[PDB]
Amino acid sequence: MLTGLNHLTLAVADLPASIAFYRDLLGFRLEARWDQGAYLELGSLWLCLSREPQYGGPAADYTHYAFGIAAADFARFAAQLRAHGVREWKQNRSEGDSFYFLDPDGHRLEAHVGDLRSRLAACRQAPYAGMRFA
Amino acid sequence: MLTGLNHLTLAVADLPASIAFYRDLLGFRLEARWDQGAYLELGSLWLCLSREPQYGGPAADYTHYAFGIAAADFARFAAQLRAHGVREWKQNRSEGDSFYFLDPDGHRLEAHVGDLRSRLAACRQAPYAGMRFA
Ligand SMILES: [K+]
Numbered sequence: 001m002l003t004g005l006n007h008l009t010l011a012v013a014d015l016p017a018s019i020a021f022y023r024d025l026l027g028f029r030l031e032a033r034w035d036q037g038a039y040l041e042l043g044s045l046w047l048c049l050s051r052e053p054q055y056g057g058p059a060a061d062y063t064h065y066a067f068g069i070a071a072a073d074f075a076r077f078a079a080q081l082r083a084h085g086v087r088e089w090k091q092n093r094s095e096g097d098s099f100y101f102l103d104p105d106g107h108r109l110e111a112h113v114g115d116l117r118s119r120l121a122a123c124r125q126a127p128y129a130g131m132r133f134a
Numbered sequence: 135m136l137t138g139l140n141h142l143t144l145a146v147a148d149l150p151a152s153i154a155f156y157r158d159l160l161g162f163r164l165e166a167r168w169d170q171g172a173y174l175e176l177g178s179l180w181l182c183l184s185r186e187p188q189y190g191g192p193a194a195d196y197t198h199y200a201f202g203i204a205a206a207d208f209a210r211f212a213a214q215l216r217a218h219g220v221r222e223w224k225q226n227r228s229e230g231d232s233f234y235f236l237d238p239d240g241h242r243l244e245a246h247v248g249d250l251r252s253r254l255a256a257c258r259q260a261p262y263a264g265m266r267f268a
Pocket residue numbers: 092093094095096097098112
């Protein structure tokens with residue numbers, strides 16, 4: 001019955017800082033803003049920012065949100081965010097270029113070259129420990 | 135230059151339980167499973183489940199992940215998951231039918247009828263406090 005992802009909503013403590021991050025560094029389009037949140041769009045992704053002034057960010061675990069990027073744009077993106085002072089949380093190890101960075105609250109983000117099909121094809125050629133396919 | 139959402143990765147304490155939930159209850163297709171994770175697909179959404187020992191779930195905030203559903207399927211989906219004993223975390227108040235439910239770790243999920251455009255149109259008629267559009 002479900003059709004795919006409809007929207008992603010992130011708690012944010014500092015709404016102005018988060019809008020500026022997602023709009024200006026990550027290139028989201030700001031579609032609406034109000035006293036307690038904002039709606040942005042990137043491709044078909046609907047992002048909601050929900051203002052929660054006491055929010056401290058997530059604890060340390062592997063939950064994260066990956067955005068796509070083309071191969072030819074990857075190096076420039078990584079270099080741009082590095083030059084802006086963005087903090088990284090992981091060095092890439094899996095198939096396809098990836099840049100693993102934190103948002104202003106500490107949500108874990110990724111910019112990734114590739115998709116599920118390229119991952120599965122790389123895994124078929126070199127399956128992970130215990131790996132089995134559909 | 136980012137293209138949209140590439141994948142969503144969730145930390146899970148009980149990888150078997152989480153696969154069963156997303157595959158068998160929510161209808162994701164299991165594409166690959168290994169000792170420390172799984173890859174599933176729903177429409178264009180690539181979901182990765184990452185095994186995380188002793189993970190206790192997120193703390194309480196509004197961060198959540200919404201999946202789309204057709205209007206004609208909404209009521210039967212909500213009824214199905216209620217019958218299966220899924221726990222709800224919010225009663226719908228915003229435009230478009232929504233069912234707000236927890237996964238086995240306590241990740242906050244939503245099944246939603248509507249999209250960003252239907253939301254913006256409704257908000258222009260009944261705006262949130264301080265709302266601005268662009
Ligand atoms: K990677």
